[model samples]
Target chain A: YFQGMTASIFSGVIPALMTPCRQDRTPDFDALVRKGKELIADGMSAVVYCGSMGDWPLLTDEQRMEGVERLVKAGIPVIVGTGAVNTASAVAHAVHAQKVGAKGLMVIPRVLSRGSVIAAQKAHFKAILSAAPEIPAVIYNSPYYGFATRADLFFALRAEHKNLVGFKEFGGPADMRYAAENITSRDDEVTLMIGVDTAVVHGFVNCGATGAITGIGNVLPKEVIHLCKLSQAAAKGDADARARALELEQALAVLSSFDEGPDLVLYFKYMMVLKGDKEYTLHFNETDALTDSQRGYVEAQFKLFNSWYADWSK
Target chain B: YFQGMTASIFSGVIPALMTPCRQDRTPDFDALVRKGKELIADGMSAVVYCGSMGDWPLLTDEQRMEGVERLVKAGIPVIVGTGAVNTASAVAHAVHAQKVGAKGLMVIPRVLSRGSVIAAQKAHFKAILSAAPEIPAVIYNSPYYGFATRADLFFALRAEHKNLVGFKEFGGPADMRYAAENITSRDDEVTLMIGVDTAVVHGFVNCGATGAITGIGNVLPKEVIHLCKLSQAAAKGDADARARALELEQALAVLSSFDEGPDLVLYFKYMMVLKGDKEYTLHFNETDALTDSQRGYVEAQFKLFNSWYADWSK
Candidate 1:
C-alpha cells in the first residue's frame, strides 16, 4: 500500500517473528496475532512467517501455511517461506502460499546437498513464479542449506521476473559482502538483507546491506527495530546514533552466538523455549521438553545479553 | 538364463546397447531388435532399455515405458533405466518398470541438495522399493551430481529386501574401489559396475569390479565387448588377453572424447545419425536431422576409431 507498484515493506528492519505455540505444542494462534500486533505497535515495517528463524521449512506445509494465512488475515504485509528441496514440492507449497493471500513469498531452493543444476534451479524458481505470478518472490538465495541465497542465482532469477524482490544472504560475511557489492543492478541498490543475527552491524554498515531478516526477531523484536533504526541513521552519516545502536547489535550478537555452537536450529528452538514462548519453540522443533540444562544454557545467554544491553545504556 | 534367476539377469555383461535410429531419427525398432539379437548372437549378455547411452532420462515417461515394453516384448531380458530426480516420479517409473515386466531396474538417487538427511534418503529408497519390490534395483551413484549413495543407504535398502542387487559407482575410481573393499557383507560381492567407461580397466582389474554399464556401447558394441573381455580376462589373471583389450579401449576412448564439446547424449545421437541410425536418435535429441557439422564430426570420430581398431588388430 506504500507505493503504486510493489513497494518493499522490507526497506526498514523486518523481524522474522516467531509462531508461538502452547505448552501442549498446539497452535496458539492468538499468541501469533498478539506478536504481529505488538511488532506493528513497535513500528516494525513488516513481519515474516516461518523463515529460517521462524523454523519455516521444518514445519509441516499446512502448519507453515496457516502461520502465513493468519498473519495476512490480520492485515500485516506477510512474507512466507516456501522453501523446498525439489521443484514440484516447492511449486506445490508456492501454490498453497498464493491461495493463502500472503503479501509476498520467500522461496527456499532445493535442499542443501551440493544443490541443483542451473537449469533445474531456474526451472524451480520459474515454477514458483508461475504458481503465483503476482506474488513478489524473494528467491531466498542462501546456499547455506536453505540458509542463504547466492548472488549468481539471485541475479538469474531477477532476469526472469521483476517480481523477484531480492535476497536474504545467509552465506555469512563473505557472501554478505558479495551481495552488497556485486549484485547492484537495480536503482534501489541491492536489497541485501543480513541473515546472520550475530553480524548485524558489520553485515549492514560495512557490508552495505539495505535491511535485515534476523532469526532472533522471534523473541527480541524491539531490539532488532532499534538496531535497524541506528543502522539506517548511520548510513545517513548520523555518527552518534550509529555508535549508540552498534551496542544493541553487539549484545544481540552474543546471545545469537549460542546458535553457532551446534545445531543452530535446535539451539534457536531451545532459546525460544527459554523465552517462555513454548508455543513458538514447539511449533518449530516439536521436542517433548528441553532439558533443564538446555533451558539454563539458553536463559543464561539471554540474561547475559540483557545485562550487556543495560551496560550499553550506561 | 546364465544366472538362473529370471529377473536378476543383470549379473553378466549386460550392455546398455544403443538404439539404431533410422535417417528420420525415429527409434528404428527393427534395428533395435537387430542390435539386441546381434548382442545375443555375439554371446554378449542382456541389453539395457533407455539407459543414459540410450537417453533414458531425457525421454518422456511414455517414451521410456514404451522402450521398456518393446525390449520386454522382444524377449531380450529387459533391463530398464528408471532413474528419476524425485521420489514421486522415481516411484512412478519404478512401478511402471515392474508392471511392464522389465528384468531389472537402474535408478539414480533423486538429486537432493542441502546434503539430505540420510534418514530421508533411506526413506526414499524404501518407498521406491516398496512400490516395486520384485525388480532388482541397481543404484547409480553419480557423485558428480553429489547424489551418490552412501554405503549406509545401500545397507539400509538391502536390509529391507534382496531386491537391491548392486550399485553402479558413477562417482569415480576411488568410490568403486571403496565399495568393492568395504561392502563384503553383501550376499554377493554387490556387483561393482563402473559407470565410467574410461576407467573400466582400472575399475575392473584394480578395483575388483564385476562389469560395467557403458555409454561407448552406443557407438561400438563389439569394441565394448572386447574391452569387457579384456577387463574380465585381466580379472581372471589372463594378462596377454588383457593387454590386447586395452588397445581396443583406447580406440573407443577417442570416440567418447567427441562428447567433450557437446553433451554425451547429444554426441551419441550425432554419432548414430552419422551411421544412418537416426530412427532411435529422434526419441532422444528430439531431432531427426543432424547438423552438417555434427554429421562430419561423428564421421571423423568413427574413421579415427576404425583406423585405431585396424592398427590394433594388425
Candidate 2:
C-alpha cells in the first residue's frame, strides 16, 4: 500500500474507472482487470470500480462483484462503488465489497428519482457504515439528482459514523469549503476529495481538498496524476509549479468540457476509445455511438487539449 | 369497472396504500386485502399497492407480487407501484404487476439513487411501458430524491408511449399545470393526478388535475375520496363545493404536516394505529412507533382535523 493509502486512502488522483464491456454489454471482467493493472502502473494512487464513470446502473449485483474481484487483485487500493436507491441494497453492496477485499467503499445517497430528505440521507450513510464496520467509507456527494449532502448532515454523519472517513465532494465549492473547514476545525479526520473533474485544481489548491475522484482520469491517468501533484505543489506555495499547474489545469478543463455538462458517461467512454481502449463504448446507451455532431465537437475539444499537451511536453 | 376505469382509470382518490405488517414486520397480506376491500367499500376509486407509502423499498419482489395478488381481489381497479432503482428492475416489477392483473402501473422515473437525466428518465419510462405494453402507466412525479420528471420529458414520454397515460404530478403546481395543459391540448387523454396531499385541491381546482394519489389517503380513504369529489366539483364551478373543499383540504394538509414533511411513512403508520389498524406499522423503521413528542404533536393535529370532520359529517 502507498503511505497515503495506509493513513488515508483518500489522497491523490483516484480514477472513477470506466467499465469496459463485451459486444453484448456483458461484464467484461478481463478488460476491467487489465485496465486496473494499467491504471496502477500509470501512477494512479487508487482505483474505484462501478462508480458513475463505471456506468454503475448498468451493472448487475453479480457483475459488480465480478468487477471488484477482478480489480482488487491489481495491487492498488480499491474503493468499491456501493451506492443504491436505498440503504438496504447499499449495505448489501458495501458488505459484498468488504468480503471481496476492497480497501474502502464509496456510495451515493438514495439515488434515482426518489428525492431524499437530509434525515433520510443521514440514515442511509449510517446504515452502510454500520453494516460494514471494518472498512472506511467515502460519501460521493454528487448533486446530479439534487440530493447533495448538506454541511449539517455531513457533520452529523461524521459525529456518528467512525468508519465515515472521507467525502467525495461534487455538490459545489461552497458546500465543499463548509465540509473542509468543519472537518479541519473539529479534527474530524474525514478526508475531502473533489469529485468534479474541472474543479479538481481549484478544490485542491483553494478549497483544501486532499485529492480527487476524477472521471477524466480514466482517459488520461498519467496526466491527471501529474495534475494532482502540481496542484499539491501549488497548494504548498510552489510559485513555479502553480504557474505551470494553471496551464495544465486549463487543458484538463477543456478535456472535461467535451460533453459540455451532459452525456458524461458517453463523453468519458468516447475519450477512452480515442486513447485506444476500443471496448469502452457505453453498455447502457440506446445508441452506443455518439451523434455525428457530438463526435465532431468532442474530437475538436480533444485537439485543443492535445495541442496544449504538446506545448507542455516540449 | 367504473366508467372512469374504462375511459381513464387514473381519476378520483387513489390511496398510495400503506403496507400492513405483522408484529415481526413481515407483510400482513390478509390485513392488506381486508383493508383493500374496506377502502373500496368506502368509495376509493382505486388502490395502489407498493407505492412510496407502502414502504416500496422495504418489500422484496415476492412481497410486492404478494401485495398485488392480495389487493387485486378487491373488485376495484388496482394500480401496482412498480418503481425501482433502474429500468431492468422497474421493468421486472412492471411485468410482474401486469401478470398479476393490475389495472395500471404507478412508477416514479427511477426509484433508487441512480440520479437520472431527463433523457435517461424518458428512456426509463419508455422501456418500462414497452415491457408491459398492455397496461396503462402513471408517472409518479414526486421530487423525493430530487429526480422529478420534467414536463418536457413527460410530454416526450407520452408522445412515445401510448401506454404512458397518467401523471401523478407532485413536482409543483407549475409542472402539474404543464402536464395538465399539454395532456389536454394534445387530446391524448392522459389524466393528471396530484401526489402531494396539500396540493390536491389546488391541483384540481386551479391546475385542472383530475385526482390524487395520496399518502394520507391510506389512513383516511373516505375523507380523501370526499375531498377529491369536492375538488372535482369545485373544478366544475361548484361554488358551494369549493367552500367545503377548502375545509377538507386544510384537514388533509394538517394530516400531511404531522411530521413537518420528512417522516411520511412513519406518520401514516402512526395514523393507521390511531384508526385501529394496529397491523399497519412500518416494516422498515428502526422503531415502528412514533416518539413521545411526535405522538403528542400528531394527536393534537388529529384533534383539529376531527373537529372539522365532525362538522362536515353532520
Candidate 3:
C-alpha cells in the first residue's frame, strides 16, 4: 500500500550512475543514455542520476535538467539528486528536477558541514517541498557529505514529506545498520536502504535493509542485479546467499582499490579505454593520472577482475 | 606602490560600512551617501561594500551592484567583498562590482567546507582578475568564511598572484605572522593586514601589518584610528602611547563581547539609532530579529560606548 513509483526503484538494486564525460571531458550524452539503458536492461528497477559519484554539483543546471529528461525519455524510472549549497539554489534545482520527469529526488540537507542543526535541515527541506510537492524523495543521510541529519530532523522531514518514502543512509556499517533497523521498525512504511561502495550487500539487506544504491553498479550493472537477487534471496532465508553476496562485495573492493579521490569517474573513463570507448588523457581539473607502478597494479587487477566478472556471469 | 591600492580588510580598524535601507526596506540611496560621508569624515580609507553585515549575499545581484554604485558614486575608494558561493556566480557578482566602479575587490574565497585547494584558490582569483584587470584585489583569507586554504596552496598562490597586492590573513595569528615574516617579506610593498578582531592591534604592527580594515571601525572609527596611531607610536619609541592604546583595545574587547554575532552590526546600528537615525532598524532581515539579550546588551553597551566615544574623541 505504501509503495508507489519509488517502490519499483527501491524494490531491486539501483546504480547511482556516474554522469559520463567524453574525451574532451564534456558530458557524454550518448554514454549516459547507454548507461541508463544498460542499468534498466540488467534488471535494476531504476537508476539514480547525479548522486555524489555522478559529479552532481559539477554539472550546470541546464545539463542536469537535460540529462534527467534523457533518462525519462528512455523510459527509465529515475531519481535525481537536486541538493545545492544553499536553500534558494536547492529549491530552484528541485523545481527543475520536478519539471523534468524525475520520479523522485535524493535530497541532501545543505551539503558541506558536519553539525548542521535539525531546524536548518527541516527549513531547507521545507523550502524545496514547498516548491515541488509532487515528486517522491529520499533523504541522503551521509555524514561524509556534511551535516548528518539528527533523528528528530529525519522524523520531522519524513512527516513533512508525503513524498519522502525512503532514506539511503551511508553513515558507515554500524550506523547504517542501526538506522535501517530503527527506521524500518518505527517509521510507518518508510523504506530504509544502504548507500556506500564496499558493504552494501551484507550491511544493507542482511540487516533488514530494503535495498542499496551504489556507484560500482554503474560499470557492473548486471552483477549489481545479481547481488540484488542474492540480497532478496538472503532476505528470504537462503543459506548460501550471504556468502555469494560477500564474494560480490570482495570483487567491488578490488575494483575500488584502484585509486583515491572522487575521480573514480576518471579511472572508470580510463578503464573504458580498454573497451575502445575513448582514449586516455588527463583533464585539466583532474589529478588522477596513473603512475607506471599504479598502471601495473591496475592491469594485474583488471585481468583478475575481468575474468571474475566472466565467471560471475557464468 | 602595490601597497597603496590594496590592503587586507582583516584587522585593526577599517570600516565595512552599512548599506542603509529606507523605511520601506528599499536601498536608502541618500542615507547610504550620507553614511559614506560620515565614514570618510572619520578617516576610513576604503569602505567595504555589502558584506554579510551589509546584507550583501541576500540581495539580488542588481541590488548588490546598485549598492556598490551608490558607495562608489559618493567618491570614496570602495572595497567590495565579491563573495558568491560558486565560481560563475562569484565572477558575475565581481563583474557587477567592477562595472559599478569599485576601486578594489575584497574577494572572499568559497565559504563551504568543500575547502578549496591552493590551485582552486589561484584559479578562482585568476578568474576575478581576468575579468577585472584594472581593479586591484585583496584576498579576504577568512577561514571562518570557507574551508581554510592549505599552507602549500597559500605559498603557491602568493607566488602566482602579482595582481593580488595584499593578503588579509584571517587564518589566525600564526599564519598572519607567518605571511608577514615569510611570505611577503621579500615583497616590501605588499600590505599585510589582520582581521582577527581581538588581535588586530598587535596583528597590525607586530605582524608587519601596514594598515587595518574592520567592521567595528564603521561604528568606532575614531577609537580605531586612535588605536592605529598608538600602535604606530608603539612601533617607534613611544611606550606610554602604546600603553594608552591598550585602554582603547579593552574598549574594543568590551564592544566585541556584545553577543559577537550580529551584535557587532546591531551595536553599530544602535549607534545610528542613538544618533536619531532610526534608518538602521529597517536593515535587519526577517529571520534575524534581535533577541532581548541582544537588544538589552547592545543598547547598554552602546550607551557606555557613546559616552566613551565622547571622551575618546575629546
Candidate 4:
C-alpha cells in the first residue's frame, strides 16, 4: 500500500528475524509466524524474514518462499530477504515475494557475483530488480561473506531503479559511518540503514543514517525502536535525549553481541528463546544443542541485560 | 553399469565440464551435451557437470538438475555435481541425479555447514549420500570457499558411507600429497582425485593419488588421460613410461594453468573454444566477450601447446 522504502512502514527498526528450523534444519514456519506477531507487537516498524539470522543462503527454496508467505500473514509489513547463491533463484524469490504481498525485498549479491567486476555485479543486481521491478527493494551491502554493493554503484543503480529504495550498510560502525558520510544520494530518493546491532547510534544518531535493520531488533524490538526514537531526537539536538541515548545504548550493547559469539544465528535463537519461546530454542537447534555451559553463559548475560532495562524503564 | 567411484569410469581424467550459457546466462544444453560427447571421445574416463567450472552454485535448481539429465545422454559415464547451499536442496539434487541415470554424485558441504563443527559437515555430506545411497559419490574437498571435507573426518565418514567412493583433493599438490600420504581408506573403498588442474602429475605420479577431477581435463582430456597412464606405469617402475610421463607432464602443465587466470571457468571455456567449438565461445561469453588482447594471448599459448603435442605424439 505504501510507496517504496520511503513509507514509514519500511523506515524504522526492521528486525532481521530468525527462521526457527526443526532438528533437521527445515524451517519451522509455525514458530516463525508466532515470532513475527510478537516482534510487530514489540514495536518493529517492519520485519525482515529469511535474513542472515534467518540463515537465508542455508535455507531451501520452498522454506525461503514460505518464510515470506507466513510472515506477511502477521499483519505487519514484511520485507523479504530474497538473496540466494545464484541470480535465477534470487530473481525467483523476488518475484515470489512480490506476488505473495511482501512489503519489500532485500538482496545480497550471488556467491560468485562478488568482487571488482562491477559489470558482473551490476547485471546480477539489476537482474533481480528487473524481475520484480515494482516492489520496494533494499540492496543488502554486507561483506561479511565478502560480497558487497559498492556505494557508488548503488547510487548509480538507484538513479534508474524506482524500487531500489535503500542501502543497508551491514559491516559494523566503521562502514555504516562511512556510508552515512559519503553516500550523497538524495534523501527523497534513497534511505540508508545500519545493520550492525551495537552501532545503531553511530549510524542512526551520530552519522544520520535514517533507519536500522538489524538482528538486535528481533529480541530487543521495543528497545531498538526506542533507540531509533532517541536517535531521531538526538539528531535534532535534543541534549537530554542524547545523554539518555548514550546510557541506554551502552546498556543495550550487552544483549545483542552475535558478532562476538561462536554462532551468530544460534546465538540470536538462544536469546529469542530466553526472551520467551522455548519451542524455537529446542526445534531450531535440533542438530546441535546448546551445552549447559553455553546456555548458562547467555543466561547471565540476559540477566545483566534485564537489569539495564529495569533501571532504564524507571 | 560401473560401481561407485571405485569403477574405472569414475577414476583417472574426469573433466569438470563447462556449461555453455547463452547471452542471458541460461545454460545451453545442446552445446553442453555436444561437448560432453566430445570430451568422452577425447578419452575422458568420466565427466562432472555443474562443478565449479560448470558454475554449480551459480545455477538454478532446474538448470542444475537438467545439467545431469542432459549430460547423462552422452555415451560416457556422467558424474553429477549435486551440491547445493542447503542440505534439503542437496538431498533433492542427489535423488534427482539417481533417477535421471547419473553415474555418480559429487558434493561440497552446505554454505553455512562449514567450520570446526565436524558433526555439521558430517550431516551435510551424509545427507546427499544418504539421498542417493546406491550411486557412486565423491566429496569435493575444496577450500577455495574455506569449506572442506577434513581428511580425518572424511575417512571416518567413508567407513560408514558405503557409496562415498572418492575424495577430490582440490587444493593442489600440497593437499593432494597430504591426502595420498595420509589417507589409508583402502583404495578400493575410496579414490583420491586431484581437483587442481596442473597438479595431476603431483597427485597421480609423484604422490600416488589415483584420479583427477579437474577443469583442464575439459580442454586436454586425451593428454590428461595419458598422464594418468604414465602415472600408473611410473608407479609400476616402468623406466620408459616414467621418462615419457615426466616429459608429457612438463608440457601438459602449460595447457592447464587455470589457477593462474583471472577466471578459472572462463579460461577453460576459452581453451575448449580453441580446441574446437566456436559456437560455445560466442554463446558462453555472452556477458563477457573475450577481448582481442586476451584471445591473441591465449592463441599464442595454444600455438605453443600444439608444439608440445606435436613432440608428444612422436
**C-alpha lDDT of all candidate models, in order:** 0.65, 0.74, 0.65, 0.72
Which residue segments of model 1 deviate by more than 4 Å? Answer: A1-6, A9-168, A185-190, A195-199, A214-230, A233-314, B1-8, B13-102, B105-134, B138-142, B145-161, B184-189, B254-303, B310-314
How accurately is candidate 2 docked according to DockQ? 0.26
Q: Between prediction 1 and prediction 3, which has the larger DockQ?
A: 3
lDDT by residue (B1-314, candidate 3, tens digit) is 53444443333356776767666666776777787778788877777777655666445556777778877887877777777655666677678776877777777775331243444556776776656665666777765544554446555654665556667776566767777776555655556766645666676557767767666666667777878888877767688877777777887776654313433555567666766777787652333345577577767876787788679757
* Residue pairs with backbone atoms closer than 3 Å in model 4 (clashes): none
Candidate closer to the true structure by lDDT (higher is better), 1 or 2: 2
Residue-level lDDT tens digits of model 1 in B107-216: 65544322234444566667777777887777777654434577776887787767777777765567777777776325563666767667778777887777577665
Q: Which candidate has the highest lDDT of all? A: 2
- Candidates sorted by lDDT, best first: 2, 4, 3, 1
Candidate whose DockQ is highest: 4
Q: Write the per-residue lDDT of candidate 1 for residues A257-291, one digit (tens) a residue.
A: 64333344556656766667555455422322445
Instruction: Supply fnat for every model shown.
Output: 0.00, 0.11, 0.03, 0.30
DockQ, all models: 0.07, 0.26, 0.18, 0.30
Model 3 chain A scores worst on lDDT over the 10 consecutive residues at A279-288
RMSD of each: 7.1, 3.4, 4.7, 4.1
- Model 4 residue A237 CA deviation (Å) reads 5.0
Model 4 compared with the native: what TM-score? 0.85
Whose lDDT is higher: candidate 3's or candidate 4's? 4
lDDT per residue (tens digit) for residues A1-314 in model 2: 11234767777778887777777767678888888788878888788887767767666766787788778866668988876655667788888887878888886776432344555566677888777777788887765545777667766876777777777777666767876776533555667888888776778888778878878887888788888899898989999888988889877786765422546778888888887778886566453456689888888887778777988878
Give the candidates in order of DockQ, highest first: 4, 2, 3, 1
lDDT for residue B255 in candidate 3, whole number 0-100 = 68
Q: lDDT per residue, candidate 3, A250-297, as tens digits?
A: 886766543224346555555555545453343323333555775677
